Design a protein around this ligand. Structure first.
Ligand code: C2E
Ligand code: C2E
Ligand code: HB0
Ligand code: HB0
Ligand code: CA
Ligand code: CA
Ligand code: CA
Ligand code: CA
Lengths: 256, 256
């Protein structure tokens, strides 16, 4: 078959609450312990099964529907974690992918605070994951939103570090708290006379005062060893677990 | 807008010859003259319009249908250029994206030769664009195909340079003739204290093989200037032209 995703299809799916948060664990690189997670959206379409984000997020962004989607994902994430919030490790980080439209929408900050207040400000840390692809623009208006969120104890990550066109300029405007190295670099062989120099360079550029580095996309122990050896702070990847449904995240990570 | 497609849908589209070669011009960095092109597939679906490769190539590759697709694209490319082959610049390069399945299929080399023989061996140069993503495996069998194609005056490019896990190893197994710097790096701002150091590093690593370098994805004169100044040999990008249909490529680039 040939299914076509249009704004009308996404909008109906939102009405039916078919966009679910799946969750991928994040770990301390030095101790191996659970420190957090990233929420990754999945469209659980009753007739066709699970549709991944690459087959709808870009249209959700250009149509504006992402705003409603992310609002639902944040409510649902809170609903999943509320019953086990007392079992989470202290300072448990929750990563939410935030596109430019979401960030700039009126009431965004109130939705962030609502998630934090449900789970416990003393307990979790909300991490808003931003990207240089189709980015938040550098305006005083955008920086004011960013600063207000920071003042309310919300933090930020930069996704896909090493792939952006003007990353220093971006970080100047949006001084985030975490740098997530793009998976492409995380998976490069240290011994390779080309690729080992690339990942070396990217990781060195990522070392900035106060910024914690997350190596995302770790698939093998040898990738993990390279990142650990470079003093990266957090690890995320298929080696540990792909993203899983809420209940499975609770059963396999919060409880283990 | 997002098309969720099955092997059965691709196969029917191949039966209907709906996969068309679009063509993007490539230029000499020093003189600005037309030197070649890259063929980029477009699914011209009669009911829904033009579907880009990101919404079907990966399934074409995993299903095996890419083999038939590329065979069609090569025949069609020859059919487009045959009527104007005498008007092409001498040594006109034709870049064809070749996935692992295509490369390894019996009769691949004969399909390459058929294209070359139609357009003229002393006239064009067929360039097979390979990628480290889902790559040809490093086996004696694979290297024998690669060598035989080289002995028949066919050449190779490495796509997406700067993104592969073990690029030196890859080039040692598959000693290509051109390096294409990935667009992500070509578009980095030289003045950026992060991104300028990344593109600097990637371009210096791209010299290491001592091959011709193509900068793809050039969108601004400043990107072009950075690449020209670094001694890159060829330029390709929206600054000059996006990929266009065959007739338009002939009318706008081949002809004057
Ligand atoms: N091969 C491999 N892949 C790994 C590994 N570890 C993690 N990943 C995948 O890498 C992606 C990480 O998220 P991302 O870079 O922000 O990249 C994300 C993000 O840009 C976007 N996205 C996902 N969820 C959301 C969302 O709720 N909102 C928005 N605006 N974008 C989202 O979709 C992209 C793709 O998401 P997913 O398909 O869920 O793909 C996810 C994740 O499952 C690994 O070890 N190996
Ligand atoms: N933003 C921007 N983009 C530019 C610019 N100049 C060129 N591009 C785009 O960058 C891509 C370059 O091809 P690629 O990296 O091999 O990346 C290709 C290639 O991996 C694959 N693909 C395309 N045609 C074929 C094919 O016939 N066979 C196979 N196996 N893969 C193909 O799909 C990918 C995407 O192709 P396209 O969507 O046609 O996208 C093309 C091209 O239109 C620029 O200045 N700005
Ligand atoms: O657990 C550490 C956290 C690092 C920031 C990332 O964005 C989410 C997880
Ligand atoms: O025109 C020069 C050619 C360089 C190799 C590329 O793969 C296509 C164009
Ligand atoms: Ca992310
Ligand atoms: Ca990533
Ligand atoms: Ca290519
Ligand atoms: Ca590329």
């Amino acid at each position: 078959y040939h299914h076509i995703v249009t704004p009308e299809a996404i909008s109906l799916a939102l009405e039916n609450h078919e966009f679910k948060p799946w969750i991928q664990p994040v770990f301390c690189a030095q101790t191996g312990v659970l420190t957090g997670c990233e929420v990754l959206v999945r469209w659980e379409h009753p007739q066709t099964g699970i549709i991944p984000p690459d087959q709808f997020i870009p249209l959700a962004e250009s149509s504006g529907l992402i705003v409603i989607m992310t609002r639902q994902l944040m409510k649902q994430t809170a609903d999943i974690l509320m019953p086990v919030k007392h079992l989470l490790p202290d300072n448990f980080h929750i990563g939410i992918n935030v596109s430019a439209g979401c960030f700039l929408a009126a009431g965004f900050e109130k939705e962030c605070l609502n998630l934090v207040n449900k789970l416990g400000n003393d307990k979790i840390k909300l991490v808003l994951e931003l990207t240089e692809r189709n980015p938040i623009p550098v305006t005083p208006e955008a920086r004011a939103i960013f600063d207000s969120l920071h003042q309310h104890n919300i933090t930020f990550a930069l996704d896909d570090f090493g792939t952006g066109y003007a990353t220093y300029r971006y970080l100047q405007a949006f001084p985030v708290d975490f740098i997530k190295i793009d998976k492409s670099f995380v998976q490069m062989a240290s011994v390779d006379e080309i690729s080992g120099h690339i990942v070396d360079n990217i990781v060195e550029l990522a070392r900035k005062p106060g910024l914690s580095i997350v190596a995302e996309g770790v698939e093998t122990q040898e990738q993990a060893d390279l990142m650990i050896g470079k003093g990266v702070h957090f690890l995320q990847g298929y080696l540990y677990s792909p993203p899983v449904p809420g209940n499975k995240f609770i059963s396999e990570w919060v409880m283990k």
